[PDB]
Short mmCIF file of C-alpha atoms in Angstrom, two decimals:
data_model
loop_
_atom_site.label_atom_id
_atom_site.label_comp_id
_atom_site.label_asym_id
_atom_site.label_seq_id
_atom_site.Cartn_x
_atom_site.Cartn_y
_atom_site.Cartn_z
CA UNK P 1 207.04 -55.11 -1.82
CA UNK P 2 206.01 -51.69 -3.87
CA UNK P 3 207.08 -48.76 -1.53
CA UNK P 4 205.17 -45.21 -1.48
CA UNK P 5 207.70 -42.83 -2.52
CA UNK P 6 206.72 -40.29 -0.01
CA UNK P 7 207.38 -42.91 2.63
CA UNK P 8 211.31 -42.47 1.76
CA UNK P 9 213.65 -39.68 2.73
CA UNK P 10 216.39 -40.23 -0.07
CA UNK P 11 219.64 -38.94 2.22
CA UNK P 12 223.18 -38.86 1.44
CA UNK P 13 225.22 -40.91 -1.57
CA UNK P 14 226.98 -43.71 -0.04
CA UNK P 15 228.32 -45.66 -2.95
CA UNK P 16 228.71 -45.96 -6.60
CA UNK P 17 226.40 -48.68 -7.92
CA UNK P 18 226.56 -50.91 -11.13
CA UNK P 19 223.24 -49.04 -12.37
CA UNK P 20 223.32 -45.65 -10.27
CA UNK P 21 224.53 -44.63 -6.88
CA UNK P 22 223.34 -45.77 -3.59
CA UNK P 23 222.38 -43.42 -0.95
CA UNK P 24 221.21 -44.32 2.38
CA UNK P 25 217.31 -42.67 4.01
CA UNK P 26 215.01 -43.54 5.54
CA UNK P 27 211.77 -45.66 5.20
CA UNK P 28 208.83 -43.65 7.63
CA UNK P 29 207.11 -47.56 7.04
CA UNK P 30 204.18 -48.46 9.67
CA UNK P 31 205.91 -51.06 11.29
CA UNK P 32 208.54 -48.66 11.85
CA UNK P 33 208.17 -44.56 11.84
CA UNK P 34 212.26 -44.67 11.04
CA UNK P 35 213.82 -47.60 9.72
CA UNK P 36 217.72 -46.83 8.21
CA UNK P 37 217.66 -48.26 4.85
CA UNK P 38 220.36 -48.48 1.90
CA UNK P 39 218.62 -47.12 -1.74
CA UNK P 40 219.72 -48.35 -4.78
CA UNK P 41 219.04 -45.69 -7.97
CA UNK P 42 218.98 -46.72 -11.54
CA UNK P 43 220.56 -44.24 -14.15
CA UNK P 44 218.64 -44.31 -17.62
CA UNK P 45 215.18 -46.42 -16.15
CA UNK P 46 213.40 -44.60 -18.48
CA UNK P 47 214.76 -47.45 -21.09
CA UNK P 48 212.88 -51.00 -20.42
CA UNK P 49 216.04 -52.92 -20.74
CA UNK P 50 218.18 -51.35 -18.31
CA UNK P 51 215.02 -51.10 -15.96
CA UNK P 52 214.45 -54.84 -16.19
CA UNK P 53 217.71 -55.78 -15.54
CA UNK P 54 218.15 -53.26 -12.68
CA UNK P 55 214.92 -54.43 -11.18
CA UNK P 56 216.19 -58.54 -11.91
CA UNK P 57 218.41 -58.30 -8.76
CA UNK P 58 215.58 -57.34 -6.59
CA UNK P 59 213.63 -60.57 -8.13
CA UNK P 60 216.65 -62.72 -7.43
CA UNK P 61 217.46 -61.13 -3.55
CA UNK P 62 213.48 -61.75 -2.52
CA UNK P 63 214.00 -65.50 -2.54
CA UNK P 64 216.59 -65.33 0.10
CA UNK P 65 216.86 -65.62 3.90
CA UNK P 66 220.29 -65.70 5.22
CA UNK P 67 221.90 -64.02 8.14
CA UNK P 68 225.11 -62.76 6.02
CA UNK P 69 223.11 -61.93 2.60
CA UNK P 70 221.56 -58.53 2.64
CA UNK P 71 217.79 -58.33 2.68
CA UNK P 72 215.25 -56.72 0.27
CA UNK P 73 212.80 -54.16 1.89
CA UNK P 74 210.90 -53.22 -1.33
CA UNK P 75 210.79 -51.34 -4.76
CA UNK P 76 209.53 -48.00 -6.33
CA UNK P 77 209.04 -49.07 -9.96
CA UNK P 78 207.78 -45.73 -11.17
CA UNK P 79 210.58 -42.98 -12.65
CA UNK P 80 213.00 -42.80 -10.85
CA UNK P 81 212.98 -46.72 -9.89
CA UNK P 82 214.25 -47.41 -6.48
CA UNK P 83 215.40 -50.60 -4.86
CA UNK P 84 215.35 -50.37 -1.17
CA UNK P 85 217.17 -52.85 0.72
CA UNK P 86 218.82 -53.11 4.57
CA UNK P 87 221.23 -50.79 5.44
CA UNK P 88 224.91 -52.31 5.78
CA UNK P 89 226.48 -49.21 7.68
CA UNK P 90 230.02 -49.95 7.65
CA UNK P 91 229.59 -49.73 3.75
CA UNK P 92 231.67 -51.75 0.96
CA UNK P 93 234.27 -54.50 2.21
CA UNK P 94 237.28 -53.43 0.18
CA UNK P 95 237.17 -49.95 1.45
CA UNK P 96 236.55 -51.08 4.60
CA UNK P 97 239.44 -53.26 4.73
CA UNK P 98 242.05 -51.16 3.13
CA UNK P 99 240.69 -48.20 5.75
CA UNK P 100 240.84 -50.59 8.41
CA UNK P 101 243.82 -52.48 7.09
CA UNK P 102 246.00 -51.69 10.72
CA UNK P 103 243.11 -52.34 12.84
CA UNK P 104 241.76 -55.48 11.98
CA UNK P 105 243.41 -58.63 13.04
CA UNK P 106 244.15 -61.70 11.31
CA UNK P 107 240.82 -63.60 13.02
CA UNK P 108 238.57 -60.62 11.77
CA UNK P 109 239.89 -61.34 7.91
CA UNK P 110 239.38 -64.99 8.68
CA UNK P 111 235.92 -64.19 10.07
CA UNK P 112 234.92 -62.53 6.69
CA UNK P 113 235.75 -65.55 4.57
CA UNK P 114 234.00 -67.30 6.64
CA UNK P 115 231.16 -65.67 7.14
CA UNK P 116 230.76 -65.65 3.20
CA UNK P 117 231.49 -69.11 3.36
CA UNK P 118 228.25 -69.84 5.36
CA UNK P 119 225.99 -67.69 2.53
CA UNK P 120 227.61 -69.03 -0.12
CA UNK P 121 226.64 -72.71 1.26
CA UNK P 122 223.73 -71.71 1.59
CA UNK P 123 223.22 -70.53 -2.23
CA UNK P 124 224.97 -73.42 -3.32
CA UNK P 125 221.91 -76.00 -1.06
CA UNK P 126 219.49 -74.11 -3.41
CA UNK P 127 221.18 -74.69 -6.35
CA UNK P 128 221.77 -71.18 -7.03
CA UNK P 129 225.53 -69.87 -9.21
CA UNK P 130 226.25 -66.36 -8.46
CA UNK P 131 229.19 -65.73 -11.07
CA UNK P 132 230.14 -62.87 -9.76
CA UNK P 133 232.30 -63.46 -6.57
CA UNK P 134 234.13 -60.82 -5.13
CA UNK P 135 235.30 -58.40 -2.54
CA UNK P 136 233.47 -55.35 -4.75
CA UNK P 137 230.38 -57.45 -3.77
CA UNK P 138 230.70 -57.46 -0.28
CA UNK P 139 229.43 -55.33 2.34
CA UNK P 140 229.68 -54.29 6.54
CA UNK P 141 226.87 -54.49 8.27
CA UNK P 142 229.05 -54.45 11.79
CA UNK P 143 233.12 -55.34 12.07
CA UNK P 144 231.68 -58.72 12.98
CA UNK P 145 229.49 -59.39 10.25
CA UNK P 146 229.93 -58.71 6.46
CA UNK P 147 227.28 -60.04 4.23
CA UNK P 148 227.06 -60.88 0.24
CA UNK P 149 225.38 -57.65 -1.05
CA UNK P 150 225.04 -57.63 -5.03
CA UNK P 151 223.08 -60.12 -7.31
CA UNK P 152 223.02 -58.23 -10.23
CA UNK P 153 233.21 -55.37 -18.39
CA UNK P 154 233.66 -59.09 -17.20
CA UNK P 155 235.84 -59.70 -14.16
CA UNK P 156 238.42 -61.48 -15.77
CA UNK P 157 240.52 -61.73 -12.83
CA UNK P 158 238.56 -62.76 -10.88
CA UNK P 159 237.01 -65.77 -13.24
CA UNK P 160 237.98 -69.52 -13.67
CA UNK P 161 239.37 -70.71 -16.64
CA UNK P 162 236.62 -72.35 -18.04
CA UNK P 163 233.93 -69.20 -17.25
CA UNK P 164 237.11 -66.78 -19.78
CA UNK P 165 237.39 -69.64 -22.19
CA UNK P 166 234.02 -70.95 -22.32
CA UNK P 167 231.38 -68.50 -21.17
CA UNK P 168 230.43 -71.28 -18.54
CA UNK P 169 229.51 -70.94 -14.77
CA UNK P 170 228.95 -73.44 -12.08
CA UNK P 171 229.15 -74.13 -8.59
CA UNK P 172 232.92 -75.11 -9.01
CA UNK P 173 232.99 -71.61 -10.92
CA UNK P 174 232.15 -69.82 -8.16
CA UNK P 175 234.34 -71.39 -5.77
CA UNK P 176 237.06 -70.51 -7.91
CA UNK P 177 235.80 -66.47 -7.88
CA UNK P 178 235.57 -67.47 -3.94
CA UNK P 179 239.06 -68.31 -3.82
CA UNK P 180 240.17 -65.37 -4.79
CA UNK P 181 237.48 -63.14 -2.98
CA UNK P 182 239.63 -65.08 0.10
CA UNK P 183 242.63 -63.24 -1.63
CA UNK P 184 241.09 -59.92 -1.85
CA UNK P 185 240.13 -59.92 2.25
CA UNK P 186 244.16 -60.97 3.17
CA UNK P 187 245.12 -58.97 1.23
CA UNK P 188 243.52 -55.86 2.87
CA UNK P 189 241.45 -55.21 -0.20
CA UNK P 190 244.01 -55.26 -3.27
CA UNK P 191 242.80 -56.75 -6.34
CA UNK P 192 243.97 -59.63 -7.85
CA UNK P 193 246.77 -59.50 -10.82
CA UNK P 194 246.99 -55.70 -10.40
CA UNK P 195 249.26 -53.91 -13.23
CA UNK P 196 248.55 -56.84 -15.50
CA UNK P 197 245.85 -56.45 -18.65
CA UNK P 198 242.63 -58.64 -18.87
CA UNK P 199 243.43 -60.48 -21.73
CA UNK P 200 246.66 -62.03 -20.52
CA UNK P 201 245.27 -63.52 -17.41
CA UNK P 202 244.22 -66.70 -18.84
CA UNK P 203 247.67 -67.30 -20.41
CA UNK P 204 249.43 -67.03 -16.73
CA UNK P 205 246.57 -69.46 -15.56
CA UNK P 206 246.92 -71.88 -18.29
CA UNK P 207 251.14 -71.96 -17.42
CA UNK P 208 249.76 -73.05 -13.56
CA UNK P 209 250.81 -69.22 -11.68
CA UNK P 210 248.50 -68.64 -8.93
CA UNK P 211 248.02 -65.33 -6.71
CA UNK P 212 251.00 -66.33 -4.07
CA UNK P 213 250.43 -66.47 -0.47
CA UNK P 214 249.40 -63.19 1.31
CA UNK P 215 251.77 -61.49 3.83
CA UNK P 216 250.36 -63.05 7.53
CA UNK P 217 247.98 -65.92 5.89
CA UNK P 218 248.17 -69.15 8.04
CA UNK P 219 249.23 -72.17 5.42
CA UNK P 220 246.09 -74.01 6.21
CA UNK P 221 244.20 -70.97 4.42
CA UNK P 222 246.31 -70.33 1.41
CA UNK P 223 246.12 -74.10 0.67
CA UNK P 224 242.69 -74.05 0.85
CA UNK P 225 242.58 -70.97 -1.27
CA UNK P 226 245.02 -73.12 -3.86
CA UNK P 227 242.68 -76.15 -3.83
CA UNK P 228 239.70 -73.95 -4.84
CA UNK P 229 242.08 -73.17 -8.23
CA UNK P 230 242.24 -76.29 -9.17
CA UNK P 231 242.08 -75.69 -12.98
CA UNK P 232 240.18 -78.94 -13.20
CA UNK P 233 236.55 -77.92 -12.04
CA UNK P 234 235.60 -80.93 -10.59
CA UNK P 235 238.83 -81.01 -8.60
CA UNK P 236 237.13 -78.34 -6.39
CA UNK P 237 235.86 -78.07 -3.23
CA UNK P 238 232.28 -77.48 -2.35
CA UNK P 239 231.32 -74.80 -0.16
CA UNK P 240 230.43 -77.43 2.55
CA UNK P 241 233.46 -78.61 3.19
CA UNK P 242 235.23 -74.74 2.55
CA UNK P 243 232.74 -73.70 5.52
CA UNK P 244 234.10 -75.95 8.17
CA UNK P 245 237.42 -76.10 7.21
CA UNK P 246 236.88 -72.11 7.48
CA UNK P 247 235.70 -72.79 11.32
CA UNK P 248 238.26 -74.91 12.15
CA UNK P 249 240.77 -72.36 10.87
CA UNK P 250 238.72 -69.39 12.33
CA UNK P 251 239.22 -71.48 15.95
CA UNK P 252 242.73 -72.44 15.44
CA UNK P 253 243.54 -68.50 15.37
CA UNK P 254 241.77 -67.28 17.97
CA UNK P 255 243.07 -69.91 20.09
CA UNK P 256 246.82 -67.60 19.17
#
């Protein structure tokens, strides 16, 4: 996985990263004289804490295959440390969506979930908790394919209960965040609670409010967004059962 240096043409920024911008280029690789990749810069590397960290998520996305989670192509671990991963050219979902927000129709939002559904399955066969579900973490590789795209201060609005309370993450944790993420893509890309401070998040979830039901979302969705906030973890779906009842859903509308 180490990459030559001079066998990538650093091109434009394309995105703010949680470490350091991301640019696309291009990898001049033997396989492939011009491949298109994404490249992922680290900010302060020079420190062997932030480095570590930074270079943690490339660790993590190596020991997945899955068509709708983006793939590592390799590293540069000398100054300035690169992570170079497949190019998602349609760039971040919530831009995307609030950009696209009059052009895409109800089946393409549905599609999305969905499509997240099916990686986040797959994470949860391999025992894997993410903790850190959300539209901000999503990317376009094509308007019919979005993929997770980030495996690296807290997201309070976005958390369950017990993750703010308790400093605890699961599987049922992340279906919560999931629930939510579902939010975020019906919603064209608004965040959740907006105009409301961190801290008194909990307190609204503790007195049972809920992010209401998105303008256009079919009832069968927003219920199943509702039963992944149960406030009782183990009242939660799986992401089995989310994923088909996400098909059946995602057939149901494009049968309208």
């Amino acid at each position: 996985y180490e990459i030559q240096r001079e066998r990538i043409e650093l091109g434009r920024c394309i995105g703010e990263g949680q470490f350091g911008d991301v640019h696309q280029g291009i990898y001049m690789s033997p396989e492939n004289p011009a491949m298109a990749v994404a490249i992922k810069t680290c900010k302060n590397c020079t420190s062997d804490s932030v480095r570590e960290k930074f270079l943690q998520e490339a660790l993590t996305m190596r020991q997945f295959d899955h068509p709708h989670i983006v793939k590592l192509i390799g590293v540069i671990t000398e100054n300035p440390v690169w992570i170079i991963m497949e190019l998602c050219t349609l760039g971040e979902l919530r831009s995307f969506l609030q950009v696209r927000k009059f052009s895409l129709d109800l089946a393409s939002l549905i599609l999305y979930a969905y499509q997240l559904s099916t990686a986040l399955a797959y994470l949860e066969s391999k025992r894997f908790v993410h903790r850190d579900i959300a539209a901000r973490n999503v990317l376009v590789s094509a308007t019919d394919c979005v993929k997770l795209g980030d495996f690296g201060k807290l997201p309070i609005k976005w958390m369950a209960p017990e993750s703010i309370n308790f400093r605890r993450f699961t599987s049922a944790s992340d279906v919560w965040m999931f629930g939510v993420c579902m939010w975020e893509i019906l919603m064209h890309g608004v965040k959740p609670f907006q105009g409301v401070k961190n801290n008194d998040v909990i307190g609204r979830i503790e007195n049972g409010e809920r992010l209401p039901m998105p303008p256009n979302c079919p009832p069968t969705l927003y219920s199943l967004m509702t039963k992944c906030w149960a406030y009782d973890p183990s009242r939660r779906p799986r992401f089995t059962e989310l994923k088909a009842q996400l098909s059946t859903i995602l057939e149901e509308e494009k049968l309208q």
